[PDB]
Design a protein around this nucleic acid. Structure first.
Ligand SMILES: [Ca+2]
Ligand SMILES: [Ca+2]
Ligand SMILES: [Ca+2]
Length: 327
DNA sequence: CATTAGA
DNA sequence: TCTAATG
């Protein structure tokens, strides 16, 4: 957590690069297990050799660890960090829509900058167009203070369209979070679950709503169960307009909410931890359900859930307010 | 790890 | 169809 720190972060930097600047899927995957194992080790790595006794730890990496240990740096690290192309990729990446594949492609064509990107907006897909357009705003954080105003509207239309709807704003938001990155809306309706073969319109109806009134401003992606967009809070009585914010709405079988809700609300650890417990408690938790374990090794049979509570009760735990679902 | 775009 | 990009 800190004794192993530079090794780990060096290693991660090492990994990140192969994966993006190169297409080194393996080397990449290589550095990460290492970076993983070396993280678990309870002592200070004092030398490659030492490290080396580790799993996933090869000659390659060990060599690297010595260099970093010996001198507070790493050339390859120093060189990459320096490398304009490689830089280039890392950057283009921040554009929502742009991934490695495209980063590389773009570069190879000579588009390495924001402006580069603009000049050739034709070279770009709708997603990336939008991304490009909302670059600043997209990178910006969402103050709760706003999360609050937004969740409000959202609940409002939800309700106006059909009163039978159930929306939830999951995420760190739902967990208190002074600020969030984007909003996560989980959606369900009684008239949609497991088998009741859809009602795409269910998703549809509400997106249309949100737009109708101006909350929705762009569509990044719209499908029958998962909508991904751009939104904005009515820029008041002028002098102050709101930044463009990513938002995502998703249809869910009414019979699958709470588990999903539980789940998306995290935190990553709270999850893991609660989950770990459901195992002892003779259960299995996953994004959609909860199944009783059968000694044979495994088992099935989805236990019915009407609330975040059922899931708790099940595993005989203390209801944890989202506030304190931190870990 | 599943959904969407797109070509 | 596959492949990429988001979460
Ligand atoms: Ca070894
Ligand atoms: Ca990106
Ligand atoms: Ca999110």
């Amino acid at each position: 957590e800190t004794l192993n720190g530079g090794i780990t972060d060096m290693l991660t930097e090492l990994a990140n690069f192969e994966k993006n600047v190169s297409q080194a899927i393996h080397k990449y995957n290589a550095y990460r297990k290492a970076a993983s194992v070396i993280a678990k080790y309870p002592h200070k790595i004092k030398s490659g050799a030492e490290a080396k006794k580790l799993p996933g730890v090869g000659t390659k990496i060990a060599e690297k660890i010595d260099e970093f240990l010996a001198t507070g740096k790493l050339r390859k690290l120093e060189k990459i960090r320096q490398d304009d192309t490689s830089s280039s990729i890392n950057f283009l990446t921040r554009v929502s829509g742009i991934g490695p594949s495209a980063a590389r492609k773009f570069v190879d064509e000579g588009i390495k900058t924001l402006e580069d990107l603009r000049k050739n907006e034709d070279k770009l897909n709708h997603h990336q167009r939008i991304g490009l357009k909302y670059f600043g705003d997209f990178e910006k954080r969402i103050p709760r203070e706003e999360m609050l105003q937004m969740q409000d509207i959202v609940l409002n239309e939800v309700k106006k369209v059909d009163s039978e709807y159930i929306a939830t704003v999951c995420g760190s938001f739902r967990r208190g979070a002074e600020s969030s990155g984007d909003m996560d809306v989980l959606l369900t309706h009684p008239s949609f679950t497991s088998e009741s073969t859809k009602q795409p319109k269910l998703l549809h109806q509400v997106v249309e709503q949100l737009q109708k009134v101006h909350f929705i401003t762009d569509t990044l992606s719209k499908g029958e169960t998962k909508f991904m967009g751009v939104c904005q809070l009515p820029s008041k009585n002028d002098e102050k307009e709101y930044p463009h914010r990513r938002i995502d709405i998703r249809l869910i079988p009414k019979d699958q909410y709470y588990c999903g809700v539980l789940y998306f609300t995290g935190s990553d650890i709270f999850n893991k931890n609660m989950r770990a417990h459901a195992l002892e408690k003779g259960f299995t938790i996953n994004e959609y359900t909860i199944r009783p374990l059968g000694v044979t090794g495994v088992a099935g049979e989805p236990l019915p859930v009407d609330s975040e509570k059922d899931i708790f009760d099940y595993i005989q735990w203390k209801y944890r307010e989202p506030k304190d679902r931190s870990e």
